[PDB]
Design a protein around this nucleic acid. Sequence first.
DNA 1: GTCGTAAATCATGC
DNA 2: GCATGATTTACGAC
Lengths: 64, 74
Amino acid sequence: EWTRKKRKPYSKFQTLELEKEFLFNAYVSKQKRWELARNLQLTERQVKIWFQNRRMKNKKNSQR
Amino acid sequence: DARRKRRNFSKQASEILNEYFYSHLSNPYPSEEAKEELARKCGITVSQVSNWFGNKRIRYKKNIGKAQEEANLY
DNA sequence: GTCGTAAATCATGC
DNA sequence: GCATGATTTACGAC
């Protein structure tokens, strides 16, 4: 009937540093997204999608 | 982290979620309105219905040679 | 952009 | 000791 990558759980340092940036701005610039990618060993896409998910997490937590 | 305050659902509610699941083998995807009503009978938030059907879909798929054919439904 | 997911993984219940 | 609910990556809809 109805029946692109293996999910990699990020490091504590990877995730925590991403969280600091989110507290400043939930939406970050394309240049800083490149910066986040450089220091935290991530691709440009993965840093982008992380902020996509973290944003929805706020809407999921703060909801009624 | 609500994984710390996690508890098993009522056995009655499980009989409802499994009722919708197996009966709709062709399309195991409840609508926004269906999930809104499915959450009412079970005393759970809609997101928990989404989590259940999310978990139940994949964990169903893993079983291809077990008595997962609990489609007694009807 | 968001929103519904598949999926690996998590944390706990028993 | 797995069953199970909730969370975390990752991607395609739109």
